[PDB]
């Protein structure tokens, strides 16, 4: 259970709007202390930034390993030369940052890991029977966006959990493809979001096999068409056995409409979805599965021996969730007039106390005691030990968006009393000061 | 308890000492499925060897907090306009590696992050009041290393956490300077390390406050000069109060002579350190704690109104922990000739089950019960469910240096029995199925 006395913590609140924040999450990032621009689409995470960012890779990390993805890292500094294995070293584009080192080698950082995951692949792979495998990393990325815009939104420093796998054949890959899926509709829902997955952009050979789980949003970059009966679909729970078929699951979600722009037919819609459940908005790329086929394997030479003795090139797929942009993805959905308002499993705090009378040595002797029992008891407490008056303690509280909050002065508490208010909805309540540990373990 | 099944998991073992391997550690590294090269002091960590480095991660982590520390994260990317500040865009030197971004702005991976650090700060700390401040991070450094070597020892892509203090004045930096002195006891002793605390290399302007952190090898690129009774001293529990006076524990440890190379003077060791005691040996440096005082602030302004009144230049100072360093370091202080021998704090698994007749209708179905039963009760426990035969179990299980192992086979189990195995002194035990859990758990 994690605690700070926010007089021992470093939290830059700030007072005025931020005139270069455009939009909700990328203001309320700036003002709440979470986060410092360095360079354009570059940023530092401050204390209270970092602690959601953490929140947040946690919940990813669960739920790949729950669906047998096995975590490694690949170093954010790649080689060129395995680059132009793939042919994309050239056809990537001015989004690559490429780097030369003090002996002129040809280096760039990472903006995605195809080539390096089945390079480690070839080297130790060589049958059949190792198959299905799913490998990823939680890896800071390099895309040199031409406009870094919108915060963590669209940022050129970025994180993102990328995933890959290797299968024999596409009905394999495919099924690995299902197991994505469902730990992409539960990693999600765990943040408190509904990022419905639509059809996207599919390669050369088209096919099927391309999501994206987008997170409705006025304010977001894709264009999106879909039947409103999909953001009423049951996510899976943590029991959802993912060696089993997955088949039924997905049919659920992928029986009603939802297209992006890049793949949206208007014939199709009207002949597939009542105009009663038409909602043509737009939304948050939060996470993307792919499946790429023999495009990596075939050029890089990736192959391994299959079930009648022959060897032919692997099958890949690819996923990814952009953890950074979720925190940015997550506070658009999740704010209101005072600030944040996080969903308790990313809260970089659960609770917060505030000592409405600093000093006075009732209530700083209550503070104290609330402070080390919840504590103790495994709960992760902000207790506001600063000099402030009162209605700045609550205005930065509400700002941060910590789940509840503890008012703790003398009216109350030189009575027996604390006030608990919960900030989804503002729902006040008093509790004896004995009482309430209880009420939030 | 992070638990997984070996069928399931990625894990290259290697049978023939790889001829790039200079040193034990970087050896069993390879040899062990922890690690592959991409370049030149470049590596992927792969399943084992990423477990490992986030054990250490946490430990360290959990140490800087406890000296009261704040974490933060700041990018690998920094502009060069921001160490022109400094003055030390052109002076560095060539481990900087220099980037040219697509509109044509000049970056670098950063090497060290003090100028950042400060820029932060100033942008934010103004008055005393705010201070002392720690304020740290674990992230991916990048130095042009003239000669990559030995593995993660010597890498260009290398983790490091760097904590930054600031402070009003030299009394005030020198107390910030004791808690990391302190933590850094705790920190190398917690990963089953003697890591000394030797007077190392100061800045041009003299003084004591310089320690390197050095764990004793023959083979190491530190020369340095003890007291052996340095190696006994004892480390500082976890109870120790940080914000009391830490000068006796700190006077402990600095009144037995310790010294590398640089700063080492014969006659005062002669003087000083009995004919018996004396020790001259190598070691590699694992730590640093250093005081720079006003040297970034100055350059960068960045001062705060102090307690008499006035604006003053802060005093800083820098303490870094080398994370992926330390993985050398453990495997060369800890190994035999079977391979690694973990200690648990940064074991990549607590337990590995071996199966020893595998496909064995009894001794699976003992296995599972087994694995999932230390599962549930927090250990994290490889189960060796493979197709091998016992002699290859038992050479895996000795090379990854697993700590405790449990032997399943079918002679055992006909009379309700297992062994349980400790890694490290061959210690076996032979003991009832029912009971093998209780002692682990
Ligand atoms: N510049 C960026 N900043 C923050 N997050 C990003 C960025 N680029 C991609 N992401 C995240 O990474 C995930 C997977 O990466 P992918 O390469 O599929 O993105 P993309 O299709 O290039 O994104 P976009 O279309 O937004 O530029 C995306 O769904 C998104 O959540
Ligand atoms: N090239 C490297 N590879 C791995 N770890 C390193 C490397 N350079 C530094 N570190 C780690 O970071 C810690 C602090 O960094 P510092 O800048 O003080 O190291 P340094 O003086 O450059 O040491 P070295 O003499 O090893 O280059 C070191 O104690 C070391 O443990
Ligand atoms: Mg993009
Ligand atoms: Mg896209
Ligand atoms: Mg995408
Ligand atoms: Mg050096
Ligand atoms: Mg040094
Ligand atoms: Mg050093």
Redesign the interface.
Known sequence: GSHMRLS???L?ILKENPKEAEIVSHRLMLRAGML?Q??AG??????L??RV?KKIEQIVREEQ?RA?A??????????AD?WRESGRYDAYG?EM?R?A??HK?E?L?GPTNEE?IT??FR??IKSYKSLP?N?YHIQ?K?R?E?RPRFGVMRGR?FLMKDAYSFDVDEAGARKSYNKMFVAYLRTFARMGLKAIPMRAETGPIGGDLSHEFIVLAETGESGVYIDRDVLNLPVPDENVDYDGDLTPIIKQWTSVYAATEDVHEPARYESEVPEANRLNTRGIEVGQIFYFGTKYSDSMKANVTGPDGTDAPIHGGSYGVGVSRLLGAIIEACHDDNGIIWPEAVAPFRVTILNLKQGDAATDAACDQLYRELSAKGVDVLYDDTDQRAGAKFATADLIGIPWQIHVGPRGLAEGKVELKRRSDGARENLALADVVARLT
């Open positions: 021992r913590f470093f830059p410092r360095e360079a570059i940023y530092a995470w401050l204390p930034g970092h960012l390993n047998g096995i975590e490694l890292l690949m170093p954010t500094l790649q080689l395995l001015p940052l780097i080192d003090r080698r280096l950082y390096m390079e480690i080297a130790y495998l490998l800071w390099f040199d031409q420093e």
